[PDB]
Design a protein around this ligand. Structure first.
Ligand SMILES: O=C(COc1ccc(Cl)cc1)N[C@H]1CC[C@H](NC(=O)COc2ccc(Cl)cc2)CC1
Lengths: 308, 307
């Protein structure tokens, strides 16, 4: 039925399911359902329906790149499925089920490869809460006691919660304000950041302090990993400008109090930022450990030239 | 008497007094004696004698820059002495004052140590110097840091200092010279002692100082070169290849393994060249001056007879 419309409203109003493959489980859900029982013609009328419902879905807040990402991957499974087909619903829904089960284990396998990086007594450093970086760092509690420096930035700040969820289970964290990321980072090694979405050229679109942070990395020459799973490799190299973000209400940065000053003064609030591929020095991923400058072909491994 | 000739032979054969106030106390000695009783004319015949005995003294092994350095400073005290101008009383008295001022370098240059090294801070030095060891020993009434010392420079005279430190102080580890780039990714605050420092701001030091300072201005950690006064040499780096000491290649290849030593060329340099584009502070005997200021400090001491 048209419960997807509710879903089309659900992404419209906001209220995030915290990126935990819930957008992916949902997009797989609705694509499974529209894939299940709909109109049927042989010659990709299903694919045309995927383009229509696709572009209607992408008409949401243009930041949830996972929605269109798994949409396009469903299309590539359709194209290869027909490619071998040269009863298709059985093969398509089965392979989509296999992609679901493969998606069902990202946060474990991307966290197994952790002992091979962090060593004893090694002052790691991140910024901003992320599920994968916390799970990833929790499987390195069967090794020695390092430190963790976490930045408290990007207000409204969703960051501390992580400083709790770590320090009551693990290593000796300290929490620094965002405006002190250059007295620190003279005494550190091995920076990690989680990623909101990563671009085709090799860019990280992340939380609103990622840049200003990576610049310090390629100033003191410390390597920064951006641990990010699959299904977040977005096409469309950074052409569209200023729709790249989320501008939120300036209540979060200035209070509605202090009247009259708020007549003539301009307030800005960006949620994301731009990390170019000239500063990332490894990707830890779900299947391999690929470098920055290789990421290109990995994208060609997944998609098809209908990247629009 | 002509015991200076013995001294002129003493620097000739080698056998260093460590550079620890032997070269300066001696040069002050012989300059005091030649200053004391010699030929006398009013119009700087003493100064001409200082030029003659000076250039004869500088005809030693051209690396002991302290000898000519204190020679030239004696000349500047002569020039200012005549400038204000029984002159022997004033000259020998002021030279005595310069001696007593020279008598306390390694303490006052080591007082200013608590204001730099902090708790839990992995310092790092290459080679061994009296002033860097005394300097680091007065920071043992603060917390337990590490010290990473490189075992460079065959003959590798590096360790004695790791002994003389470890049995009195912090947890030092000793690395070979060929591992100064797996380390120096996990360090801060490098220190090096200086054999002599040039006018432009250069450090002429032990034979691994370069390749180390390059790592400092690659990972951007600051390197202090703690060096007292009297070692500010004029003569910006013009004279080439007399800038060193080439020693016998027995120290790097053994006289054993015959016939290979027919056709193969062995090199052995003792010093190297650190340019002023990489040093990031000087801790000194009177102040704490930066690199790019060092220029006028030299003009504070000498006179344009710098040859
Ligand atoms: O625990 C801390 C303090 O951590 C912070 C300091 C400041 C801030 Cl803002 C946050 C955290 N510092 C330690 C961390 C281990 C290190 N390394 C060692 O203990 C020894 O490591 C070495 C030593 C020598 C070599 Cl060659 C290699 C590693 C010393 C400094």
């Amino acid at each position: 039925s048209e419960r997807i419309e509710s879903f089309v409203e659900t992404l419209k109003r906001g209220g995030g399911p915290r990126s935990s493959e819930e957008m992916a489980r949902e997009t797989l859900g609705l694509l499974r359902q529209i894939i299940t029982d709909h109109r049927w013609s042989n010659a990709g009328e299903l694919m045309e329906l995927i383009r229509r419902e696709g572009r209607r879905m992408t008409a949401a807040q243009p930041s949830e790149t996972t929605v269109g990402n798994m949409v396009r991957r469903v299309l590539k499974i359709i194209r290869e499925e027909y490619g071998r087909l040269h009863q298709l619903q059985s093969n398509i829904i089965e392979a989509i089920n296999e992609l679901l089960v493969e998606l069902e284990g990202t946060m474990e396998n991307i966290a197994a490869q952790a002992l091979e990086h962090i060593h004893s007594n090694e002052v790691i450093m991140t910024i901003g809460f992320s599920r994968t970086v916390e799970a990833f760092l929790k499987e390195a509690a069967r090794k020695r006691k390092f430190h963790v420096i976490v930045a408290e930035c990007a207000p409204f700040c969703q960051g501390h919660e992580m400083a709790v969820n770590l320090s009551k289970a693990g290593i000796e964290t300290t929490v620094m304000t965002d405006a002190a990321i250059f007295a620190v980072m003279s005494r550190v090694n091995k920076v990690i950041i989680g990623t909101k979405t990563i671009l085709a050229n090799g860019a990280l679109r992340a939380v609103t302090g990622t840049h200003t942070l990576a610049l310090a990395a390629k100033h003191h020459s410390t390597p920064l990993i951006v641990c990010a799973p699959m299904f977040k490799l977005s096409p469309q190299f950074p052409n569209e400008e200023d729709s790249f973000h989320k501008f939120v209400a300036p209540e979060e940065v200035l209070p509605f109090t202090e009247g009259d000053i708020l007549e003539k003064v301009s307030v800005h609030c960006p949620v994301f930022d731009y990390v170019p591929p000239e500063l990332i020095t490894l990707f830890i991923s779900n299947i391999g450990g690929n470098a920055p400058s290789y990421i290109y072909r990995l994208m060609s491994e997944l998609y098809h030239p209908d990247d629009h």
